[PDB]
Amino acid sequence: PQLTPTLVSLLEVIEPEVLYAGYDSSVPDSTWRIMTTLNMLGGRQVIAAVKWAKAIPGFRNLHLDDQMTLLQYSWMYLMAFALGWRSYRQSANLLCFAPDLIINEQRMTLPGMYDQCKHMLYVSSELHRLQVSYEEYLCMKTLLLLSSVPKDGLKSQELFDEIRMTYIKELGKAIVKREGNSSQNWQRFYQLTKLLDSMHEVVENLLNYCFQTFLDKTMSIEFPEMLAEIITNQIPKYSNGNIKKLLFHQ
C-alpha cells in the first residue's frame, strides 16, 4: 500500500521507551521518597525527550537556540501529556509514572499527593472521555513541544510556523483515519485542540509546584542536574512575562 513513510509512522518509531523509576516497593511508601524518585525519573525522561525532539522531522533544521528554548518551555507539557496517556492506557483514576511506580488508590491518599496529582488525573480522564487514538496522541505530543514561544519570537520563527502547521494537519489526518463517524471529524478536531489549550493551565499548576519545591530551603529534596538548570533558567522567565502561550482557540 504505502512504501514511502508518512509523518505519523515516523513519530511512532521515535516515541521514547517507557522508563523505570527504580522504586523499591518492599520498603514502606513515603511522600518524600516518591517526590525524590519522580524528580530523578523526570530528569531521565526530559533527556529522553531531547533525543526524541531531534528525530522529529523539521526540528533539527531550527536554530539551536530555538531547539533549546522549545524544550525549556515544553518539558512539563510533554511529561504531563505522556503521563496522562500511559495512565489512560494501563487502566481507574491511577497515574502510571512507570511500571514499577503507580500512584494507586492507597498512595493517592498520601499527604500532599492528590493536591498535585489531580492536575495530571484531569489529563488522564480527558484522554479517556475523548477516546484519543495512538496516532492522535503522537501528533498531539508533537504539537505540545511547539506550544510556547518567546514574546520577542524565535530566530527561525517562520520555519517554526511551517513545522507547527504541518503537525496540525498531521493531527487532522489522524482524526480522519480513525475508525468511526467521519461526520464528527471537524467537531473532534475542535475538541482535541481544545484539550491541547487546556494543557497550559495544567502545566502552569505543575510548574508552580515544581518551582516552589525547588526554591524551598526548608524542603531539601534532590533534583537531577540536567533538570535543575532548566528550572533555574526558566524560573526568572515564568515570573517576568517573556513567554507566549500558543492557543488554538482564543
Binding site: 531531547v50 524544550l71 542536574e225 532548566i230
Partner: peptide
C-alpha cells in the same frame, strides 16, 4: 546557558 542540553541537541 545549559551546556549539557546544548550538547545533547547538537550531538
Amino acid at each position: 546557558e545549559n551546556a549539557l542540553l546544548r550538547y545533547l541537541l547538537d550531538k
